[PDB]
Write an enzyme that holds these catalytic residues in place. Sequence first.
Site, PDB file in Angstrom:
ATOM      1  N   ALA A   1     -17.502  21.847 -37.097  1.00 44.87           N
ATOM      2  CA  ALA A   1     -17.031  21.156 -38.290  1.00 44.87           C
ATOM      3  C   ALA A   1     -18.186  20.751 -39.202  1.00 44.87           C
ATOM      4  CB  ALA A   1     -16.247  19.930 -37.897  1.00 44.87           C
TER       5      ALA A   1
ATOM      6  N   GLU B   1     -27.016  17.864 -48.363  1.00 47.99           N
ATOM      7  CA  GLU B   1     -27.078  19.306 -48.523  1.00 47.99           C
ATOM      8  C   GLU B   1     -26.542  19.745 -49.877  1.00 47.99           C
ATOM      9  OE1 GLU B   1     -24.673  20.208 -45.263  1.00 47.99           O
ATOM     10  OE2 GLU B   1     -26.306  20.917 -44.018  1.00 47.99           O
TER      11      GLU B   1
HETATM   12  C1  HEM Z   1     -18.504  19.018 -46.921  1.00 51.39           C
HETATM   13  C2  HEM Z   1     -18.501  18.211 -45.820  1.00 51.39           C
HETATM   14  C3  HEM Z   1     -17.469  17.713 -44.988  1.00 51.39           C
HETATM   15  C4  HEM Z   1     -16.171  17.423 -45.257  1.00 51.39           C
HETATM   16  C5  HEM Z   1     -15.367  17.735 -46.520  1.00 51.39           C
HETATM   17  C6  HEM Z   1     -15.661  16.757 -44.069  1.00 51.39           C
HETATM   18  C7  HEM Z   1     -14.393  16.293 -43.908  1.00 51.39           C
HETATM   19  C8  HEM Z   1     -13.936  15.602 -42.825  1.00 51.39           C
HETATM   20  C9  HEM Z   1     -12.582  15.163 -42.642  1.00 51.39           C
HETATM   21  C10 HEM Z   1     -11.436  15.435 -43.580  1.00 51.39           C
HETATM   22  C11 HEM Z   1     -12.533  14.417 -41.524  1.00 51.39           C
HETATM   23  C12 HEM Z   1     -11.360  13.607 -41.042  1.00 51.39           C
HETATM   24  C13 HEM Z   1     -10.411  14.427 -40.187  1.00 51.39           C
HETATM   25  C14 HEM Z   1      -9.022  13.829 -40.039  1.00 51.39           C
HETATM   26  O1  HEM Z   1      -8.721  12.839 -40.736  1.00 51.39           O
HETATM   27  O2  HEM Z   1      -8.226  14.366 -39.239  1.00 51.39           O
HETATM   28  C15 HEM Z   1     -13.854  14.464 -40.988  1.00 51.39           C
HETATM   29  C16 HEM Z   1     -14.202  13.904 -39.805  1.00 51.39           C
HETATM   30  C17 HEM Z   1     -15.422  14.072 -39.194  1.00 51.39           C
HETATM   31  N1  HEM Z   1     -16.475  14.750 -39.724  1.00 51.39           N
HETATM   32 FE1  HEM Z   1     -16.557  15.646 -41.392  1.00 51.39          FE
HETATM   33  N2  HEM Z   1     -16.616  16.614 -43.110  1.00 51.39           N
HETATM   34  C18 HEM Z   1     -17.691  17.249 -43.638  1.00 51.39           C
HETATM   35  C19 HEM Z   1     -18.887  17.408 -42.979  1.00 51.39           C
HETATM   36  C20 HEM Z   1     -19.222  16.850 -41.783  1.00 51.39           C
HETATM   37  C21 HEM Z   1     -20.528  16.999 -41.184  1.00 51.39           C
HETATM   38  C22 HEM Z   1     -21.734  17.629 -41.875  1.00 51.39           C
HETATM   39  C23 HEM Z   1     -20.435  16.482 -39.933  1.00 51.39           C
HETATM   40  C24 HEM Z   1     -21.377  16.486 -38.884  1.00 51.39           C
HETATM   41  C25 HEM Z   1     -22.556  17.149 -38.740  1.00 51.39           C
HETATM   42  C26 HEM Z   1     -19.071  15.975 -39.837  1.00 51.39           C
HETATM   43  C27 HEM Z   1     -18.607  15.309 -38.770  1.00 51.39           C
HETATM   44  C28 HEM Z   1     -17.397  14.699 -38.727  1.00 51.39           C
HETATM   45  C29 HEM Z   1     -16.922  13.974 -37.592  1.00 51.39           C
HETATM   46  C30 HEM Z   1     -17.647  13.580 -36.328  1.00 51.39           C
HETATM   47  C31 HEM Z   1     -15.684  13.655 -37.869  1.00 51.39           C
HETATM   48  C32 HEM Z   1     -14.698  13.040 -36.912  1.00 51.39           C
HETATM   49  C33 HEM Z   1     -14.751  11.556 -37.148  1.00 51.39           C
HETATM   50  C34 HEM Z   1     -13.576  10.835 -36.549  1.00 51.39           C
HETATM   51  O3  HEM Z   1     -12.513  11.469 -36.389  1.00 51.39           O
HETATM   52  O4  HEM Z   1     -13.701   9.636 -36.243  1.00 51.39           O
HETATM   53  N3  HEM Z   1     -18.360  16.167 -40.984  1.00 51.39           N
HETATM   54  N4  HEM Z   1     -14.722  15.209 -41.775  1.00 51.39           N
HETATM   55  N1  LIG Z   2     -15.906  17.431 -40.498  1.00 55.53           N
HETATM   56  C1  LIG Z   2     -14.639  17.605 -40.025  1.00 55.53           C
HETATM   57  C2  LIG Z   2     -14.359  17.053 -38.763  1.00 55.53           C
HETATM   58  C3  LIG Z   2     -13.106  17.151 -38.156  1.00 55.53           C
HETATM   59  C4  LIG Z   2     -12.943  16.561 -36.890  1.00 55.53           C
HETATM   60  C5  LIG Z   2     -11.715  16.633 -36.221  1.00 55.53           C
HETATM   61  C6  LIG Z   2     -10.655  17.299 -36.840  1.00 55.53           C
HETATM   62  C7  LIG Z   2     -10.832  17.883 -38.106  1.00 55.53           C
HETATM   63  C8  LIG Z   2     -12.062  17.829 -38.805  1.00 55.53           C
HETATM   64  C9  LIG Z   2     -12.315  18.404 -40.085  1.00 55.53           C
HETATM   65  C10 LIG Z   2     -11.307  19.098 -40.789  1.00 55.53           C
HETATM   66  C11 LIG Z   2     -11.538  19.667 -42.049  1.00 55.53           C
HETATM   67  C12 LIG Z   2     -12.805  19.554 -42.644  1.00 55.53           C
HETATM   68  C13 LIG Z   2     -13.817  18.875 -41.972  1.00 55.53           C
HETATM   69  C14 LIG Z   2     -13.608  18.289 -40.698  1.00 55.53           C
HETATM   70  N1  LIG Z   3     -13.410  20.286 -34.736  1.00 57.21           N
HETATM   71  C1  LIG Z   3     -12.561  21.265 -35.151  1.00 57.21           C
HETATM   72  C2  LIG Z   3     -11.820  21.883 -34.148  1.00 57.21           C
HETATM   73  C3  LIG Z   3     -10.915  22.900 -34.427  1.00 57.21           C
HETATM   74  C4  LIG Z   3     -10.219  23.457 -33.360  1.00 57.21           C
HETATM   75  C5  LIG Z   3      -9.304  24.488 -33.574  1.00 57.21           C
HETATM   76  C6  LIG Z   3      -9.096  24.947 -34.876  1.00 57.21           C
HETATM   77  C7  LIG Z   3      -9.800  24.373 -35.934  1.00 57.21           C
HETATM   78  C8  LIG Z   3     -10.728  23.340 -35.747  1.00 57.21           C
HETATM   79  C9  LIG Z   3     -11.455  22.731 -36.773  1.00 57.21           C
HETATM   80  C10 LIG Z   3     -11.296  23.142 -38.118  1.00 57.21           C
HETATM   81  C11 LIG Z   3     -12.007  22.563 -39.170  1.00 57.21           C
HETATM   82  C12 LIG Z   3     -12.913  21.544 -38.886  1.00 57.21           C
HETATM   83  C13 LIG Z   3     -13.086  21.126 -37.555  1.00 57.21           C
HETATM   84  C14 LIG Z   3     -12.382  21.699 -36.485  1.00 57.21           C
END
Ligand code: HEM
Ligand SMILES: Nc1cc2ccccc2c2ccccc12
Ligand SMILES: Nc1cc2ccccc2c2ccccc12
Length: 403
Positions: A240, A359
């Site tokens: 992700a 980035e």
């Molecule tokens: C363009 C950049 C990114 C976008 C648009 C994005 C978007 C998201 C979204 C939508 C979620 C919430 C998922 C949900 O509500 O089900 C999320 C969670 C998360 N993202 Fe990103 N993400 C990005 C980049 C990153 C990066 C660079 C990392 C790590 C190297 C990252 C790590 C995480 C983690 C650990 C979560 C899970 C947090 C949690 O569920 O408590 N994300 N991200």
């Molecule tokens: N950075 C992200 C982390 C996630 C962690 C768990 C589930 C979905 C996402 C996810 C889904 C769409 C885009 C980004 C993320």
């Molecule tokens: N952490 C994630 C797990 C997944 C597992 C299955 C399919 C998509 C994702 C996925 C798709 C977008 C971002 C994060 C994830």
Amino acid sequence: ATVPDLESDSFHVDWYSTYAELRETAPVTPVRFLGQDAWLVTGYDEAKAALSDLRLSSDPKKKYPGVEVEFPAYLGFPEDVRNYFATNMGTSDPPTHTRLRKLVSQEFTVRRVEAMRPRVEQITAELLDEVGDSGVVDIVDRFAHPLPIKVICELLGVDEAARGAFGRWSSEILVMDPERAEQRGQAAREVVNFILDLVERRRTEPGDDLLSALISVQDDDDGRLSADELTSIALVLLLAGFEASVSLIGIGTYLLLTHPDQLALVRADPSALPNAVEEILRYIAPPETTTRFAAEEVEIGGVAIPQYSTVLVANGAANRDPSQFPDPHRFDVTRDTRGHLSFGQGIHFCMGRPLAKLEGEVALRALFGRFPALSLGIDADDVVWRRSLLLRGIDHLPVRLDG
Ligand code: HEM
Ligand SMILES: Nc1cc2ccccc2c2ccccc12
Ligand SMILES: Nc1cc2ccccc2c2ccccc12
């Protein structure tokens, strides 16, 4: 009425137009996807409320009586690999999510990320130095793709030798084709194996990267990361964390190129890039939809969503809600992007936000500066979009460097 299928082209061709049509019919409507009935939220207010209402679980491994939890994202993944993909913060509900996020936020600090900048600019420099100054090039395969990969691989201490290949594995993981399911289950397995081996090498050879750091993290009452949790944290961060960033750069590159008006602004005013990155996320949110499961009967926008349902929160659609973002179709670098749902909303808010923006800013700035006459090498309406509701993006973007 007619139950829209999320596989139809309407959700993959000028899709922001069908969203707006459904959002006007009913902000919360039943749908069919991958062969399961689900609920689609395309309203801003409804989406935000949904990401905050905790009766909607993010846990796909929760067992309930006489029902089978099946998050579309897991199309094809055998159970043991699903668990490996679903034992971290993004797929857990409190209190587990609470301890999991606390232990990780301890090392995944803004400090650590800020200390990366110099290398991020260096990696960015090296890539652009290797493209030249003439002809057409695939800006994705040559810039938007490797940059994010080199960054997070350095963050998690990935062995550059036995690195690569997952790039092909995640490509296959990002599309949910009901027929290529086995190919999707096979890719997922490979990924899990690379990670299992990755941590073990790390378990054996310490370093001062985030991963070794996570392997030695401990707390008073909250405890520490177990083997399964650790391997799952590493996987999600690496997957992700690189893919979503790739979408940021490619989409962002395409957008400015097709809106000269905005490129000139970003190009003149430096302080305009931090906000430009924000409008990019808003305009074409990579996480097109996010998934939740109704653990209890929930009521979204006057509509009662039955218990044990699959709720798909269309973040991308919510970003275009006219009653929240005036004229949602005008890509504007000056606009107030506050409140967009691209980094999530609530307790699962994106932890990687500051590295993502680091980035986006560094990449776009370097690109458009070193190539002041950069042009899109193809008809704008010819850009091919990835048929993925999971993670939207562009896989081949040909641009001309000199003219
Ligand atoms: C363009 C950049 C990114 C976008 C648009 C994005 C978007 C998201 C979204 C939508 C979620 C919430 C998922 C949900 O509500 O089900 C999320 C969670 C998360 N993202 Fe990103 N993400 C990005 C980049 C990153 C990066 C660079 C990392 C790590 C190297 C990252 C790590 C995480 C983690 C650990 C979560 C899970 C947090 C949690 O569920 O408590 N994300 N991200
Ligand atoms: N950075 C992200 C982390 C996630 C962690 C768990 C589930 C979905 C996402 C996810 C889904 C769409 C885009 C980004 C993320
Ligand atoms: N952490 C994630 C797990 C997944 C597992 C299955 C399919 C998509 C994702 C996925 C798709 C977008 C971002 C994060 C994830």
